[PDB]
Structures are given as C-alpha cells and as structure tokens.
Write a protein that binds this ligand. Structure first.
Ligand code: ATP
Ligand code: ATP
Ligand code: DEX
Ligand code: MG
Ligand code: MG
Lengths: 644, 409, 259, 630
C-alpha cells in the first residue's frame, strides 16, 4: 500500500512550560543543579590539562564562587571550568534535550577517572523556577568572551561581551523574582548547600558582605573519605569524619567500611555511635539514618526500604555511581535496587557486631546501649535469627554479676541437661529468691534470669539453642533429672493428702483449676503455677499495662492457675490431720484462703482486690493484740418438714 | 532399630495375623476383658523398618478399650492374649491392619506392620456418673445392636452373682428400670442395666455407693455398703419413650406421677429413691418444651417441688452442698419460698457457714416473722460464732509476744 | 512531656492452641467381607458420627472465647453448625489421603464411587467430593483449615440472636483475624491475600448449600423407615430438636462475603 | 553590538528517551493513561451530540472494551469516542507535548459541563513502557479509517486502513514486550483498573476466554456518589458505597458528606466504621485511610500530611478538581494545599462526633471502639482539647454503670467544690473499694474513676475543665472543705501520736519519707500516699512495662512514699501505748513492718520483696494452727 512516513516533532512552547512547572517539586534544588553543572565544567578542564598543561595557562585554581547581591535581587555563580564557545553556547543551551557532558563522556576512553553528573539535558532550565531572567557569561580558551541572555520566552540571544575578561570559565547570573528573595540570605544558602552538595570535589566559597568587607566563607571543608581505600584510613580520620557528619562531639564506637563490586557498585561507611539517642524509639521522622548519594550528590534520606527498623541506630553513607534516577533526580527509578542494597547492608552490620563481640570490654559498652535493638531483630528477622541470638547476654544463677552467652550456658551444663531452664520476672532479686528455682538450685542447675519486659516476646520466637529447647520453671510439668527412687517416693506421697486435694479445690473452686501435690517446693508450703498454654504471670501484667491495647483479648488469653502443695511442710501436714478430723472446720476454710492469697503474691500475680487481703490481716492483728472483742464483733417449726 | 521379626512364628489359631512373639514375660495375672481399659506401651516399626511414630516415643501410655474395634484387629487381639508386663512385637498381617487402603503417609497398601505392645495395667469400665469406680464392668462374651434400655423400660435379664464370698442364686428379672427396691437389688444394677446391649453377657462389680445400701437386707446376709459382683445376661427390653419425642402432656403427666412417687419414697426413708424420682421431673420439664400457659404453670409447680425436695433429700443424705444447689434452683423459681430459704440456711449452718446461715434465717423472719424455727436457728448460728471467736481469742492471745520471741531464736 | 511508647506486636497462638485442642481420628467399621448393604454403611457411619459429634463438643468447650459464651449459646452454635463441621472434617481427610473421589471417614472405612449405593450418596456425593476437591485444588494448609473450622462453628445464629451476642461478635472477628494471618503466612503476598481469602470465604458460605442439601436427606433417612438404620440416641435427639428450627426458618445464615 | 536571536529547539531522540525511561516510576501507568484518553474521547462526542444528535448515528453506546490476546502477545483497547481525522493523527500523536484535549477545552463555551483529564501531551507515549510496537486504528465521522504505527524509533507512519470498519472510535493495539506479559492476565488487569480508574464514568468491560466462550465482565460497577447532592442520597445508598469502597461486610456507623467551595474546591465523604478497622491482610502498617482523587482519577493514598493520626480510622474520599499535579500525575505540587485540606477535614470530623453524641445509644457504640483515639487527640493537637474533652466519658462513684461526661460531673458539683476529684487505678472495683475514697464518699463528693493505662498520660494535660481544677485523691495535701473543729482535734491528738511518728520514722527510715498523722482515713489504720509533685503508683507500674524503656527515667520517675496514720484506729492506739512503754520492744518492730507492708498493697504499690511478707504470714499461720516452734 501507500505509506506516508513522518518524523516526530515537538511543541517547544509547551515543552518549556512542562519543564518549569511539572518536573520539580521543590524550588530550592535550582542551586543544586547549577553547582553540579559547574563541577562538571571543572572536571573537564582538569581532564584536559592532564595531558596538555597549557590548558591552564589562563588560570590554575579550580573553584566555585557563590555571590549573592541584595541590592539587585541577583545571585551569581562563578566557576573556573572549561567554559563554552559560541557554537557550544548556542547548541547546548538552545536545545532542550541536548547534553554536552554526555557527549564528552562518550568521547572519553575507558580508564578515564572522569565521573560526571548529568545526561538529561534539561537541568539548566530549573533556574527559571526562581529566576525571572538568566544571563550567562562565558570564556573558552579557544574563543571570544560571549554573553547569552534569556527568559523562557521561547527565544534567546547571543552577543559578544564587553566587560572584564574572565580569563576562562562560566558565570551565571540569575535575576530573581520578587518573592524568591529568601534565597539571597546567607542562612538559607548554607542550609541548601550543606544538604545537597557537601561532597563536591571542588571548594565552594560564599562571599558575604559584612560590617564594609567581604567575608569569604568556605563550605565543603569535610571531604568524603569513603572514596579512599580503607586500608589507608586511620581511626582518627574516621573519627573526625564521623563527628563532622553527625555533629556529635563524641567519637564512634565502631566502624565498618566496605565496598561491593559487580552489577551495582557500592561504597559504604557504617558507624555505631557510643550512646543510643534518647529518641531512638520516639522520633517520628523516618528512622533510618542512612544517606544515599549518587556520584557524591545527595539523593535520598529517610528511606524505609534501605534498612530494617531494628538497625535504625546505624549512622552512615551509601554511595554509588550507576543507579538510574527519575527526572527530578530525587529518587531511584527502580525499587529492586533497594532490595539488593538492603541485603548487603544488613549482612555487613552483623559481621561488624560479631567482630565487636570478641572484645569483651567493648562488647559490654555496646550491649548496654543497644541490646533492645538486638532483641527486636530476633522477633522480626527470620533469616538472621540464628546469628543474632549469639549476641545475647544474660545474667544467670551461676554467673554472679557477669552476663554470659547462651553458648556459655550450654557448655557448663550437665549430661542430663536436655533443656535450658529460665525464669522471667520484674527484677533480679525477686527472681533469684523465687521458690520456683530453689529445687533447681538444690541440684546445681543453672537458670537464666530474664528481666527486661521485652524478653517475654523473645522467648516465643527463640524456642531453642543448638537443639536444646527452653523451658520455663514457672509452668506446670517441669521435668527434672530425678532419680527413680525419688520418683517412687513422690508417688507414695500422693496416696496421702487426697482429701486436701479435694477439700482445697472446693474451698477455692471458683479461683483455681487444680490443686496438686508437687515436687518443686523444698521450702514454702505452696506456690501457683501456670498451665502450659496461655499468658503467664508477667506476660499478663505487661499486656495489661500497655498504653494502647484492646482488653477484649484478655478474655481469651489468660493463665490457668494450678495450686501446688508441698507435702513436707508442717503447715500442710497439720492441715491434713485437722481437715480429715473435720472437713467443715471453719478455721481450715479461712486459712486456706489466706495461703492462697499469699501464694499469688509470691508467685507474681496481683490480687483481685487487695483490700480484702488487708482486712484479713487486720483482723488477725486485732486478735493478736488482745483488742477487746467489743470492737471486732457483735457477739410453725414443722413448715420446713413438709414433703412436696 | 528394626527387629528381625521374620524369625517369629504365628500365635495359635491366629489366622487373624497375630504373631507368637514374646520379648518380656508378664506378672502371671489374668487377661483383660471386653471393655477393659488397658494401659499400654505402644511404638514400633512399619513395613521394612519404617519408623512408627507413637505415644510412647515420649513415654505416654495409651488407654485402649478391648473388644470394641477402636484399633486395628491384630492390636486388639494382642491385648486380649497378653498379660500385664508382657511385651510383644506384632507383625500384623495386612488384612488385620489397614488392608489395601494404604493409610498414607506411612502405611503401604497390603503392608505388614510391627507393633510394640506392653501391658502396664488395666481396669474395667466405669458405669457410674463420676469416676469413683463405683460400678465396674468386665464384658464376658456378648452384646449386639445399638439400643440400650432406660428408666421406665421393661427389662428381661438373667441375674446370678456374688456378695462377699457367697453367691446369689440365679433368678430371672422382668422389671421396670429404676425399681431397685422391687428387685430388692443394689442401686448400681439399674445404672448398669441401662448400659447393657441386647444379648449382653458381662460381670458388674459394685462398691458401697452403688452396692446394696438401704436396699440391703439381712436375708441375703448383706449389710448396707456391701461389696458385690454380678453376672448378667440381658435378653431383651422395651425401651421407654424419650423426652425428645414426648408431648407436653406426657411430660407433665409423668412428672406428676413421679412427684407422688417421690413423696412416698421420701416419707418411707427411701431418700435415694426419692431423689432419683424427683430428678425425673426435672429432666422432663427442664428439657425444652412448648407448653400452653396452663401447662407451663403446672410445669413450674412441679419443677419447684423437685428442686425443693431434691434439696430436702440432700439434707437427709448429708449432701449439704448439693442441698444448696437444689434449693437455689427452687429459689430461682420462687425467691420467697419459705422452705427453700429455710433449708438453704440449714445447709449453711450444717457446714459452719454461720454468717450465711444467719443471712437466710434473718430473711426467713423478714418474710415470715412467725417462723419460730428461724428464730431458733438464728440464735444457734450466733452462739456458734461466739464460741469460735472465744477460741480464736485464746489461740492468738499472745501471738505477737510469741512471734517476737521466735524471731530472735 | 511523657508520651506513650509504641509496642511490638504480640504473636497470637490461636492456631497452635487449636492444634492442641483437636481430637484424634476415630475408628469405626465392619469387616469388609460383610456385604456393603446400603443400610450397613449408613448405620456404621451413624455410629461413627455420634462419636465424632460428641468429641466436637469438648473440642468446642476448649476453644478460647467460645468457652466464655453462655452455655445456651454454646449449645445453639453446636447444633446449627454440626453438619458443617462434620462435612468439613470429612473433606479434609479425604483430600489429604487421596486426589481420587473417595470419602475417607475413618482409617477403617473409605467409600469409593462404586460403594456409594445410597441414592443420597449418588446425588449428594458431588457436594461431599466438591469440598474435598476444593481443598485439594486450593492446596489448603492446616493452619488455614483450623481457622476455618472454627469459623464454621461460628457461621450461624438464631434469627432471634444469641444471649451473649456482644461476646459472640468478638469471637468472630478474632478468628477472622487469625485466618487472615494463616493466609499471609503461606502466601507472602499482598493483594493476593484478599483474593485467597475470598477463595476460601466462598467455601464457607457455599457450605450452607452443601449442608442443606445433605440435611434434607439426613432428615428423610431418620424420619422415614426405608432402610434398617440405627442411630445413636444423641443423634436421634439432635435431629428432632433441629428439624423444626430449620424447617421454621429460625436459623440465620451469616454469610461473610457476597460478590 | 549586533545581537543574534535564536529560537529554542529540542532534540527529539533524547526527548523521547526521557519520556519513556525517566518520567514514570512504575508500569501500571500505561493502562491508567490509555483509559483516561478514552474517557476524554467519549466526553467529546457526548458533548457534541447534545446540539447535533446525528453525531451518534454511527453508534450510540458509549463504552470502553479491554481485550487481551495471549496468543498474539497483544492487548487491545477499544473506545467508541470521537475518533481522529488524518490531520489529527499527525498533529496530536506526532508532536510531543501537543494536546488536543487542551485545545478542545479552550474552544468550549464557558458554561459547558466538561471536566477532562489531560493537558501535558505526553501520556500516550507511556505505552512504550510495556510495548515494542504500537498500532492505532481510528475512525472519525468526517473521515476514512486510518492506521498509525510506531516503534518510537523517531519516526511513524500513516496508512489508509483496509480492514474491518469501525463505524466510529479509536482502537489501540499494543504489541507487548516479550518479557512483560503479566499484563495479559485477567487477574492483573482487574487489579490495576480497580486501583486507578474505577470511577471513570463510562462502563469498562473486560473480555476473556474461559470454559469455550468470552466472559464479558464490567469492572466499574460502583458510581462516585459523592458527586450527587447529599440530600438525595439515602442511607442504603451510602451503605452500599461504603461496603464497595472498603470490602467490608459490616455497614458504616456514620457518614459526613461535605463540600468546600473557596479558593480550593472539593468534596468528600467521610465514614466512621462500626468496628475499629484493622489490617486483615498485609499492607503498610499505619497506612492512613483517606484517598485523594482528581477528576475521579486516583492520585495517592497514604499522605500523612492530610489528617492527624488520631483520626486515622476515618475512611474516605476526597475528590478535587483543579489541583496542580506532577508530570507523573502521582504527586501533588505545592504541598501548602494539603495543609488547607487537613484543616477542613479535621473541623468536620469533630462536628460529626458531636452529632453522634446526641444519640446516647449510638454514642456508646462509638466510644467503645474509638475512645482511645479521642484520648490521643487530647494529648496531641492541643488546639482542639477544648472540643475533644467534651467527648470523654467516665464511670464515677455516683453513676452505677453509666458513663458520664465531665459536664454531668460539673452539674452535680456541690457549691463548696472548686475541685473535681478523680482517682486512677487498675480495675473498677479496686478503686471503688479504696480507702482513698471513703472519706469523700462520707461527705457526698463524687469521684471519677479512671482506669485505662492511657488515662495517666491524658490526665496531665487536662488540668482544668470549665474553670475547675482536676485533683487526685491519692496525693499529699488533699483538700476537703471540712469544718476546722477536725483540725483542732488532730492538733490535740498529735501530742501523743508524734511519739509514734518518731519511732516509725526510725523504723522504716530507709523506706518512707515521713510518717504523719492524717484525716483522709476512716477505717483502715494507715495508707501510703504520693507526694504533691512526683509520680503515682500507677505511673510506676506502667513505666515498668513499656518494654522500650530508658534507664535515667526510671530512676527519675520513682515515687516518694509518705505514710499516713489513722489516730483513731484501735490498732494505732494499742501501738502507741506499747511503743511508749518500750521503744525497743521487738513486738513493735515487727508490728510496724507488717502494717507497712499491708498498707503498700492496699494502696496499690507492688510489694518488692515479696518473700518476706509471705514468710511473716507463714509464721502467723503456724501459731493459728497450734504448730509449735520445733
Ligand atoms: N557552567 C558551565 N560550564 C560549561 N558548560 C556548561 C555549564 N553549564 C552548562 N553547560 C553545558 O550545558 C549542557 C546542559 O546542561 P544541563 O544542566 O541543562 O543538563 P545536564 O547536566 O546535561 O542534565 P542533568 O539534568 O542530568 O544534570 C551541559 O551538558 C554542558 O555541556
Ligand atoms: N482514543 C482517542 N480518541 C481520540 N483522540 C485521542 C485518543 N487518544 C489520544 N487522542 C488525542 O491525542 C492527544 C494525546 O494526548 P496524550 O494522552 O498524550 O496527552 P494528555 O491527554 O495531555 O495526557 P497527560 O496530560 O497525562 O500527558 C489527545 O489530546 C487527543 O487529542
Ligand atoms: C449422606 C449423609 C451425610 C452423612 C454424614 C457426613 C459427615 C460425616 C463424616 C464422618 O466422618 C462420619 C459420619 C458423618 C457424620 C456422616 F457420614 C453420617 O452421619 C451419615 C450422613 C448423615 C448421611 O449418610 C445420611 O443421610 C444417612 O443418615
Ligand atoms: Mg546539568
Ligand atoms: Mg492523555
């Protein structure tokens, strides 16, 4: 058939408007773009002088000057880079999607040390976000000095300059809009510059008129150091960098500097601070303090995808030279990249901690600040759970005041220690003196003391260490490596007190699930234990105390209480004899309740109504003191025989 | 590891696929009977050394009901032929296992399986309401169909048996279930006949709570709270109509008859029988039923009478806690029932709940100021408390002084 | 100046609690050399049913939340869903043991197509087999299964409501949330989880058709006397108590999802 | 000096690359854009047909069809809109940033009821995010059918179409990239359409093959009812919209249909659920629930800037015409706009809650699920405490089981009250029976019972209500407007009881700050109270369970404990007499500790030993049972 063929066209007027109004969300970036263009201009001249030094005959200092002018509502940026010839000036600034730097890089041969920022061709025009008019003055070594002028009117002009020679380089003058004058203030400048530039290879000097004279203040004093081989960096150097980066008067605790090669190129510095921040779990700004740079230009911060939350205390920098960006250069074009970055950053953080742990003194300093984060990692990171667990330290019944690892536990333990025993509670003293661990102490078994509330969750998730499961000494069914003779004696004793098992349950029918004869008590007449499933003491108080929780769940998850009796206590034996003689003896009923309430307190449970515990005691005190009974106390017949 | 089971022959006549294997000898005691719950070791190997995962891998003894077919046949038989302490590993022939089904994931179809069985102990069936072991059944040879007799059923059973070390001779019994005294037999045999299948042949053992009680007679040389065992053969029965198929009429009619019967039993001192009769009211009328208003009112009167008399029976039977529950039900129906309230107070005094006893006798007088007995009760309750308080005062008279001394020894 | 702290999410154990609660598969049967008379199969299954049904009661009593409902409500819920639960239980065992059109009732007894000699099985096995087929097709996990079984217990109420209604409603949301977790846990997905959910909610809602068609045959078998069928006394009782609730339209179906 | 003037030009090859590779953040977008172009095509013809009905002679049903074809690895979109003439294929598709839609709008009479999506002129090319080649077939009423083709290589072609007649409309055929074929799946297409374009006015039908036949499913079955006048919408209609929107099965509890007509214009529907919302399935935790649409097209759904977190259980839609958008149309330009929207959404939510409060039964239903959020809103966002506090409800000592407002408490205040009394604790019952409220009850004063852990945070902001000061009944210095005669009696008795204060100050020196004679007590011998400034027992027990705890704050927030003595109690008088007789009597040393320990428990403090307490009791019991020492 007949086919007509056409080239694509573009409407310049609309295209110009889109660049100005729809590509960028934050006007402050105009400065970023102008600075980046200048740093490229400087790299290109540097590259050329590398093989032919005469290129710098026109001047050797490579630097960027920022010169605001209040009086004219203008801002001038001056570099000392190559500059542009008349032909380039027209072709590169007059063509909306052309890029001279891209062409330059294409011209360059492999092995060049040149890394340039840009390739899109539309960045310059961002000047019009704040400028009314833009003037560009430039001098190239091979041409006359020329002045370019425009506004986004759809045309532009070129004339020969008549002013002072620049020697070489490009000078960009913005004439600002009346309401954009905030960009002429020194404070605002410096804030923008610090945020978006910072690691530019050339110095930036800001020229400020003061009480007049010009105060020449240099920015970019801190150099990136991640670019250096780590072998070559001293600890002092890392420390100074760190302090500058975080405005932290204190040094780092630890640092990991590494690189990744292949597919995605990386360099990164990860620092561990010596103090956890007070707002570590409270600040509402995004938690990951990792800044992402591309070709040393800041791109993104506060990115959730880079690091799992449990590691939100690591401070650091990630820098790459090959990731795709969107048009505004404010975010990555493809999210799968972040998936990879995250995998590698986590892997190396764990290596750092593992190594850190070999130094016991330093590990203590570390653990004391960040043990909370490790524990959260146990709950959430299902892949590194088997590595994170080796970083845990606990006080135990053996260990005096030292905290020990789980590995340490498991080498001191005994041939019959098929299980790892632990107890949880509010504080070390209460736990240490608990009835629940006395039998274990008697036989020389070690018990791990878990104190922080968070531990209640970790034990769920942990289950076992090297094949040995964890068991709670506060639950029913605790297995001890008892002798067979001991087991037989314990069973013989169950043929006794049968009546108390029943009587006590009846007294306390509405309060407990079971009354049983036990063996974990070698002190105390009784204790309360929880059945194998459901919330235990501590788990319940913690949940009840949360600021924001649905209490409807407490109608499902609750302890089932069993009361354990020590048959070799004198109270119990006396009650057996007394109760068998008279099961309705009122004094038995009252003392059984008192023992029950006492057991709840000693076992870690609160009382339903503490007042009526207190009243029982007060009554006994009054009798004990001889308080006269005057205050403690006040002191047809066949109808009910009817058979119906 | 797997045993060399291929070296073991088959148990005599066990064409049922049961292996003649003994690894451990027993205690020499007898075999379990049908219905006995036999507590056993159970682990083993499946075809060609396949591991069998079971309850004794964690030392959890399995409770097995012999002769009911709840396990593969070879296992059921091994229990029947094993003594306590004996250990067998049975190469169950496939037909007596899962056959061709190939019960996945671990049983190949037509697989020979090796099960390790040990008997630790056994008991007969508990035929009682609570696990007291009051009525124990050991089935001898028979029982078929899924029907069983119930209260009001007319039952034909042959009974022969023992008491102490002497025997009851054989007699044929044709009777209505629940008429224990007109069998002049233990209460327990009602409860036991009610669980028998047609043709059933079994032995039933009775402890004192089911064994002859106030039904016991010197003519059999049997005291109340007797030790008994009987051999029963259930031949037939006429099952009584059940509440789920009964009319609102029939429920009230039968409850009325029962109230009258219960009244008599109570008056005759047959308090257990009275109790058993009054309970019949309760299930016919508590069971969901659509009654007319007149019928509902009759039902309410009958329900109240049961609950009041049940409490009364419980008081006579010294079940004071039960008396509390039954009188409370009566009081839910009638909150001012003089008898229910008075009786609740008595039950409390009976177990020394003096304060509660007083609360009820005080209420009786508030409603019925002329209940002279409530005044009498109320006064006793008060004095009983006073006496105890005096004892406590003496008990703790020097409590602090003695503790101060103990604390410093 | 003191502000609330945030908390980690506590992991529910409702599925593992259910794993502990669940009863064993019960044995029942007759020697296979005995002819498969239609009535023999049915009587055997009624006896099995009776035992399974009572096991389901203690199973229910043991369930968190449910156990705190007024007893009358507990009995009501058990009656209305008893067939949903039994049908679901059968479908599971069947499909897990085999992809074939088998009804695996007990380790002792499996009914293949050639043994379905009862007009009811010829007509209704398509639904019994449907459930097995869907569980097979959908590769349903055990965690999802348990969550769903619990929800079936909670699938219907009297049109007049429950006494502890404001508890019932809690319990229902509680288990919906647990099922949602059972799904997330096997999928690892986002939007696919709602879709998986609806693949499954539609079962639970279509289960009402499965039950009513079977229910009518169950009632016909019990009430008429066409075969030598013995019933457990407990099933005879539930059947006559349930027939009028059903036939009078007093049962409200709670259908989770429509569309 | 001669000055040369130049026009700006553009490099087409690079321009095309930027549009395809670095404008769009995702690939879902290509469908989003093609559908929007079709709805504009349909509106243009619909409009013209209003003055000249013959425009529809070529076909009257206005609809959009989606037809995937797995076999050819293609996807076809068919509209029944206005179509394009040969001239337009060249001018509108061959020119970057040309927009026919924009020109059309400019040419309209000012009152035309037209709202169209588009103005940038680049969305068409988003097709190349997933396509290797694009073919466009079109029929305009005034011209022949033509076929446009391009691989985006810097040229395109136009041919006369020799295939089947269309009658009218545009058909876009994408030849998909070999490696991006998930877009041919029914599942994926439905997900995308529902997310981005479910409120497009014309029906969209998806055509797929199944057991075979073609299953024709309409996807946009729900109408954007917010465009309707609110007075014409019934509750059933709102309820259905709500369920559809949220995939709920439960109905809504309340709805507010609101509009704004100022510098900004928008409409919104805000719904309150009958059950607190929850993350049934994986989503971003703490995602908010207000979705923002422009001209019925979805823009974004988790913009924190839109509404405070405490109101994140409101579900809803904001639909606003004329907001400036980013080139990707995924983000809003000029964020100051969101600030304005937020102000208005909050204002109206508060009005809605106020309205619910009128219906006591419904308010309870509300409050039972959402009272936490109200409380958070007291703590946070202080400018609204003045309204939020009136939505609070509490149990009090005078309400039985009703919860009442602070206004009811105020109504019932005695003329001598300047203070509102409250107590905090763990349960209703533990507070109700507390010694601390016994005297207040004696004098007929009402006490508010605060129970939830959150109440402790909240109470620190609510210092005043209608000019009255809020005070606690468990602290030092509690004022009760009693007659001075009582003060005189205490001064008269302190002369004999200070001796115990001194003895008891030595006992327990390390445990309490002081021992004083008090009057808040009636029947207990003693109690423990908190200092005027410091933290209460309830504060300590909750701080201890925060899990994400600091250490310096635990030392810092520890409570100071003061012991108060009831002089009039028989135990205390006996104690005075014995203690004076012998300061070092061992019996006194132990009685004092026992009373102290008991007081902590009844006062709500955890007993820290706790074993000693148990042991003291065990000895008492042994004597009670007649058990000797040996
Ligand atoms: N100060 C300068 N000195 C020398 N050449 C310059 C200067 N500023 C701009 N140019 C030239 O103008 C071209 C256009 O630059 P512009 O900043 O618009 O785009 P870019 O940097 O190529 O793109 P991007 O938006 O990716 O940064 C450059 O490629 C370069 O050749
Ligand atoms: N299906 C269609 N029927 C009729 N005309 C169409 C169709 N698709 C595109 N056009 C025409 O081609 C032009 C191309 O517009 P395009 O979608 O690229 O930009 P737009 O609508 O401004 O989208 P955006 O603002 O998102 O870039 C439209 O303005 C319209 O005149
Ligand atoms: C087809 C129906 C559906 C049947 C039941 C389906 C569910 C079920 C699963 C089992 O694992 C054991 C028994 C039961 C619980 C059942 F098999 C029997 O009860 C008999 C039954 C009601 C039925 O066979 C009859 O209508 C005969 O009464
Ligand atoms: Mg640039
Ligand atoms: Mg468009």
């Amino acid at each position: 058939e007949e086919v007509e063929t056409f080239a694509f066209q573009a409407e310049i007027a609309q295209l110009m408007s889109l660049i100005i109004n729809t590509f960028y969300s934050n006007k402050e970036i105009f400065l970023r773009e102008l600075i980046s263009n200048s740093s490229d201009a400087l790299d290109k001249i540097r590259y050329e002088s590398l093989t032919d030094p005469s290129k710098l005959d026109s001047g050797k200092e490579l630097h960027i000057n920022l010169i605001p002018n209040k009086q004219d509502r203008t801002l001038t940026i001056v570099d000392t880079g190559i500059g542009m010839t008349k032909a380039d000036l027209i072709n590169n600034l007059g063509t909306i999607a052309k890029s001279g730097t891209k062409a330059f890089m294409e011209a360059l041969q492999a092995g060049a040390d040149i890394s340039m920022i840009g390739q899109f061709g539309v960045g310059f025009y961002s000047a019009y976000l704040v400028a009314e008019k833009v003037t560009v003055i430039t001098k190239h070594n091979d041409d006359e000095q020329y002045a370019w002028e425009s506004s986004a009117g759809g045309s532009f002009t070129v004339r020969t300059d008549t002013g002072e020679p620049m020697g070489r380089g490009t000078k960009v003058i913005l004439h600002l809009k009346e309401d954009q004058t905030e960009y002429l203030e020194e404070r605002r400048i410096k804030e923008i510059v610090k945020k978006h530039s910072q690691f530019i290879g050339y110095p930036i000097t800001l020229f400020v008129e003061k009480e007049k004279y010009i105060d020449q203040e240099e920015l970019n004093k801190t150099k990136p150091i991640w670019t250096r081989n780590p072998d070559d960096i001293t600890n002092e150097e890392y420390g100074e960098f760190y302090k500058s980066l975080t405005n932290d008067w204190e040094d780092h605790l630890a640092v990991k500097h590494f690189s990744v090669e292949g597919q995605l190129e990386f360099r990164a510095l990860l620092f561990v601070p010596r103090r956890a921040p007070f707002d570590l779990f409270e600040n509402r700004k995004k938690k990951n303090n990792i800044k992402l740079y591309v070709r040393r230009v800041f791109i993104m911060d506060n990115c959730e995808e880079l690091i799992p939350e449990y590691l939100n205390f690591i401070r650091g920098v990630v820098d790459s030279e090959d990731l795709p960006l969107n048009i505004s250069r404010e975010m990555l074009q493809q999210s799968k990249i972040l998936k990879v970055i995250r995998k590698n950053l986590v892997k190396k953080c764990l290596e750092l901690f593992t190594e850190l742990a070999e130094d016991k003194e330093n590990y203590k300093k570390f653990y004391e600040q960040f043990s909370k984060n490790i524990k959260l990692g146990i709950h959430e990171d299902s892949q590194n759970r088997k590595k994170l667990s080796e970083l845990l330290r606990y006080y135990t019944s053996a260990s005096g005041d030292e905290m020990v690892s789980l590995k340490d536990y498991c080498t001191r333990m005994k041939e019959n220690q098929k299980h790892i025993y632990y107890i949880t509670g509010e504080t070390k003293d209460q736990v240490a003196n608990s009835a629940f661990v006395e039998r274990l102490r008697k036989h020389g078994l070690e018990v791990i003391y878990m104190i922080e509330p968070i531990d209640e969750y970790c034990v769920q998730q942990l289950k076992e260490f090297e094949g040995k499961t964890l068991v709670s000494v506060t639950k029913e069914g605790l297995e001890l490596p008892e002798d067979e003779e001991e087991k037989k004696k314990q069973e013989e004793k169950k043929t006794k007190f049968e009546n108390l098992c029943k009587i006590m349950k009846d007294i306390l029918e509405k309060k407990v699930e079971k009354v049983v004869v036990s063996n974990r008590l070698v002190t105390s007449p009784c204790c309360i234990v929880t059945s194998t499933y459901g919330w235990t003491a501590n788990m319940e108080r913690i949940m009840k105390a949360q600021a924001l929780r649905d209490n409807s769940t407490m109608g499902y998850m609750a302890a089932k209480k069993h009361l354990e009796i020590n048959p070799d206590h004198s109270i119990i034996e006396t009650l057996r004899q007394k109760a068998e003689a008279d099961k309705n003896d009122k004094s038995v009923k009252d003392l059984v309740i008192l023992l029950y309430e006492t057991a709840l307190l000693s076992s870690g449970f609160s009382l339903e109504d503490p007042q009526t515990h207190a009243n029982r005691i007060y009554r006994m005190i009054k009798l004990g003191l001889g308080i006269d009974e005057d205050d403690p106390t006040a002191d047809d017949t066949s109808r009910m025989e009817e058979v119906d | 590891a797997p045993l060399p089971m291929e070296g073991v022959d088959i148990s005599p006549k066990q064409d049922e696929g049961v292996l003649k294997v003994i690894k451990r000898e027993g205690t020499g005691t007898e075999m379990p009977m049908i219905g006995d719950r036999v507590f056993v070791h159970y682990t083993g190997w499946l075809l060609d050394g396949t591991k069998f995962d079971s309850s004794l891998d964690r030392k959890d003894k399995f409770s097995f009901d012999l002769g009911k077919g709840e396990v593969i046949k070879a296992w059921d038989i091994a229990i029947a032929t094993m003594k306590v302490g004996e250990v067998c590993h049975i190469t169950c022939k496939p037909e007596y296992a899962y056959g061709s089904a190939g019960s996945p994931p671990k049983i190949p179809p037509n697989a020979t399986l090796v099960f390790e069985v040990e008997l630790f102990e056994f008991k007969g069936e508990d035929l009682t309401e609570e696990e007291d072991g009051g009525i124990i059944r050991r089935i001898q040879t028979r029982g078929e169909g899924y029907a069983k007799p119930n209260e009001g059923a007319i039952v034909e059973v042959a009974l022969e048996g023992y008491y102490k070390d002497k025997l009851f001779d054989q007699r044929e019994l044709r009777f209505e279930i629940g008429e224990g005294e007109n069998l002049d037999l233990p209460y327990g045999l009602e409860r036991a006949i009610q669980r028998m299948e047609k043709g059933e042949h079994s032995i039933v053992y009775l402890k004192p709570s089911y064994a002859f009680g106030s039904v016991g007679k010197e003519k059999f040389q049997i005291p109340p709270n007797a030790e008994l065992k009987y051999e029963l053969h259930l031949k037939s029965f006429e099952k009584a109509k059940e509440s789920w198929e009964m009319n609102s009429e029939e429920k009230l009619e039968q409850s009325t008859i029962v109230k009258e019967r219960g009244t008599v039993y109570f008056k005759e001192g047959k308090y257990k029988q009275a109790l058993l009769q009054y309970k019949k009211i309760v299930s016919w009328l508590e069971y969901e039923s659509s009654f007319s208003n007149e019928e509902a009112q009759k039902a309410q009167a009958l329900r109240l009478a049961s609950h009041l008399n049940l409490a009364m029976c419980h008081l006579k039977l010294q079940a004071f806690s039960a008396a509390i529950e039954s009188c409370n039900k009566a009081l839910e129906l009638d909150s001012n029932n003089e008898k229910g309230l008075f009786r609740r107070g008595e039950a409390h005094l009976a177990v020394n709940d003096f304060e509660l006893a007083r609360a009820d006798f005080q209420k009786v007088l508030q409603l019925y100021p002329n209940n002279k007995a409530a005044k009498t009760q109320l006064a006793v309750c008060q004095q009983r408390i006073r006496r105890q308080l005096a004892r406590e005062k003496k008990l703790y008279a020097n409590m602090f002084e003695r503790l101060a001394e103990e604390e410093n020894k | 100046t003191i502000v609330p702290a945030t908390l980690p999410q506590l992991t529910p154990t409702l599925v593992s609690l259910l794993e502990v609660i669940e009863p064993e598969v019960l044995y029942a049967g007759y020697d296979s050399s005995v002819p498969d008379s239609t009535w023999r199969i049915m009587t055997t299954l009624n006896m099995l049913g009776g035992r399974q049904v009572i096991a389901a009661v203690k199973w229910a009593k043991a369930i968190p939340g449910f156990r705190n409902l007024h007893l009358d409500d507990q009995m009501t819920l058990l009656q209305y869903s008893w067939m949903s639960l039994m049908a679901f239980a059968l479908g599971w065992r069947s499909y897990r043991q085999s992809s074939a059109n088998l009804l695996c009732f007990a380790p002792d007894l499996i009914i293949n197509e050639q043994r379905m000699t009862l007009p009811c099985m010829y007509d209704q096995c398509k639904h019994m087999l449907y459930v097995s087929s869907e569980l097979h097709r959908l590769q349903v996990s055990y965690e999802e299964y348990l969550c769903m079984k619990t929800l079936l217990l909670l699938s219907s109420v009297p049109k007049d409501g429950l006494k502890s209604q404001e508890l019932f409603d809690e319990i229902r949301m509680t288990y919906i949330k647990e099922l949602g977790k059972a799904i997330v846990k096997r999928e690892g997905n986002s939007s696919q989880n709602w879709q998986r959910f609806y693949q499954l909610t539609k079962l639970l809602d279509s289960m009402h058709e499965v039950v009513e068609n079977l229910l009518n045959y169950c009632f016909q078998t019990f009430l008429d006397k066409t075969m030598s069928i013995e019933f457990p006394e407990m099933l005879a009782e539930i059947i006559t108590n349930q027939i009028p609730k059903y036939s009078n339209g007093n049962i409200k179906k709670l259908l989770f999802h429509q569309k």
